[PDB]
Amino acid sequence: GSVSKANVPKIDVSPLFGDDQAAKMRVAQQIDAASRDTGFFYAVNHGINVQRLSQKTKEFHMSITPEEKWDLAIRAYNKEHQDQVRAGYYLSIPGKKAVESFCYLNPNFTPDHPRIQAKTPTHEVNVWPDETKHPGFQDFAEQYYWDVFGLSSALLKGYALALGKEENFFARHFKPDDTLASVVLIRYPYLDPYPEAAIKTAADGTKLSFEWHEDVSLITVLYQSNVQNLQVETAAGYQDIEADDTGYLINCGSYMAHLTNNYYKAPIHRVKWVNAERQSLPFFVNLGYDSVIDPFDPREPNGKSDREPLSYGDYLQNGLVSLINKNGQT
Ligand SMILES: CC(C)[C@H](NC(=O)[C@H](CS)NC(=O)CCC[C@H](N)C(=O)O)S(=O)(=O)O
Ligand SMILES: [Fe+3]
């Protein structure tokens, strides 16, 4: 029962911000090769100060009190907050559940936004802690949303060129005024003793914090601290993904797999149990509620696919509910 390591290439994505079109294609080739292999790659030379990101994230988790957690809790933990299906605090349960997190959405989702006015599902107005109790936290969090939005937009240009399309094939549906993208600030704590009820056992015997799944996203742009935990499933079993706290771990979600007729699969992955204090900060690249991408098959000469065009809002609503049903309330 030995575990091999996945090939996760480090791809210099900096040409995707520039105007060297041939250099972009060489990045797009690397994205294509990784997407056809294990499905994961590390985006390096990305331009985001991930050191300050981890600092402000650590200060928040370690300073927020049980009172503030109730005040920000999503509906799953607080019946009073019926509007908080997505955004808010995800409480840990000592002795039963180790993980806790804070999820926020598009800062442009305000009471003035028409999707909020129409009460469209998956659209919510972010909740925030008290400014004086968490100085600068909301400003940092909202700016990070747009920092990683910019990186994700360039990554989407690479994916589009990799699939033989014009560079805005995905990015044109990725807009600040309507994106359903989310940030989740996850804390995985060190615990002694660690509650066995918080540990799950995979079929192959591996102890897990979160079971196998495909991401509900177009792509996922993830930062993690330097604690190895992720595994990707291959035909020869699960393979360890090595940690890198300077780059962004990138992978496709099931929406990408649908629209490419599984040409770019959504890699199945799981989270091993590790008794180590660590952060996981995913940015789930979601499109707009009405966004619809016509499916195609890059393996066919005509590129024709028989799959239905899927509206992203309906995909996201069904996907997040199914993931909760399958892998439990996080
Ligand atoms: C918290 C931990 C258990 C982590 N799990 C996840 O984040 C999973 C797998 S990707 N994804 C979600 O729960 C979707 C979140 C959607 C978000 N609430 C929104 O409204 O967009 S971990 O184990 O993977 O680190
Ligand atoms: Fe995931």
Side-chain angles (χ1 to χ4, degrees), residues 1-50 53-54 57 59-61 63-78 80-118 120-132 134-171 173-174 176-195 197-199 201-206 208-241 243-264 266-303 305-330:
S2 42
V3 181
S4 51
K5 306 184 177 303
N7 187 267
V8 183
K10 304 187 191 300
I11 297 178
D12 190 331
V13 296
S14 69
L16 294 175
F17 305 110
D19 291 314
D20 192 333
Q21 311 300 337
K24 290 178 175 173
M25 294 291 284
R26 292 190 289 270
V27 178
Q29 187 280 325
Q30 300 177 71
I31 292 173
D32 173 78
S35 305
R36 294 287 289 166
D37 195 8
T38 70
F40 287 83
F41 70 89
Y42 269 114
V44 301
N45 216 7
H46 48 69
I48 300 185
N49 186 348
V50 298
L53 161 72
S54 179
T57 292
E59 300 167 4
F60 170 78
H61 281 142
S63 66
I64 183 171
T65 59
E67 183 176 20
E68 306 173 85
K69 287 171 179 174
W70 290 127
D71 290 354
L72 295 176
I74 60 168
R75 182 172 66 189
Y77 298 95
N78 191 331
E80 305 182 11
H81 302 163
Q82 290 292 304
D83 292 333
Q84 299 192 40
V85 178
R86 303 179 63 194
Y89 206 89
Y90 293 54
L91 277 74
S92 71
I93 308 175
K96 298 295 181 182
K97 173 178 182 281
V99 73
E100 54 181 298
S101 66
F102 174 78
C103 168
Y104 59 100
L105 309 173
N106 192 333
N108 292 321
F109 291 165
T110 67
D112 292 322
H113 196 287
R115 286 299 186 179
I116 298 303
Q117 290 173 334
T120 300
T122 68
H123 299 87
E124 303 168 14
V125 175
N126 288 330
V127 293
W128 298 101
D130 183 28
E131 169 66 33
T132 66
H134 298 261
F137 171 76
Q138 179 180 353
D139 287 324
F140 145 80
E142 292 191 352
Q143 179 58 261
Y144 176 74
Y145 189 97
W146 301 122
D147 279 17
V148 71
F149 182 102
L151 167 64
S152 301
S153 292
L155 296 180
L156 290 183
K157 293 175 181 175
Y159 277 101
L161 295 171
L163 289 162
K165 298 284 189 178
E166 64 98 4
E167 78 170 10
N168 296 125
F169 181 82
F170 300 111
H173 305 278
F174 190 53
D177 73 297
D178 70 352
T179 176
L180 291 164
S182 63
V183 175
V184 190
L185 307 177
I186 305 166
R187 178 195 171 192
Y188 268 105
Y190 171 84
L191 297 168
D192 180 64
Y194 208 105
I199 307 175
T201 301
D204 65 358
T206 306
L208 305 175
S209 288
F210 196 74
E211 255 283 17
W212 73 268
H213 69 282
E214 299 175 342
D215 278 357
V216 180
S217 65
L218 179 58
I219 67 170
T220 303
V221 182
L222 169 65
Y223 179 81
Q224 285 188 322
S225 52
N226 183 33
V227 177
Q228 195 282 327
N229 67 94
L230 270 168
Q231 291 184 318
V232 57
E233 182 183 37
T234 70
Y238 283 89
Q239 294 183 341
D240 282 325
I241 297 175
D244 183 356
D245 66 354
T246 70
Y248 275 95
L249 188 60
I250 314 301
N251 65 273
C252 300
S254 58
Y255 193 81
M256 181 72 82
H258 170 78
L259 69 96
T260 63
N261 197 359
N262 209 45
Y263 182 72
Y264 286 0
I268 288 171
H269 54 282
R270 62 189 187 184
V271 179
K272 295 188 304 182
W273 165 78
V274 189
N275 193 4
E277 189 69 46
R278 62 184 179 91
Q279 315 164 313
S280 189
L281 318 176
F283 178 67
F284 295 111
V285 180
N286 296 317
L287 304 184
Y289 190 82
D290 284 353
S291 294
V292 174
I293 292 181
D294 292 357
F296 61 103
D297 195 351
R299 291 156 310 196
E300 295 298 324
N302 57 16
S305 172
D306 270 359
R307 295 188 170 182
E308 299 295 331
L310 171 62
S311 71
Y312 198 93
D314 301 324
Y315 159 81
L316 182 63
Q317 181 175 6
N318 300 147
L320 296 189
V321 171
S322 295
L323 185 53
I324 291 171
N325 293 348
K326 179 204 171 304
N327 286 22
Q329 171 61 59
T330 71

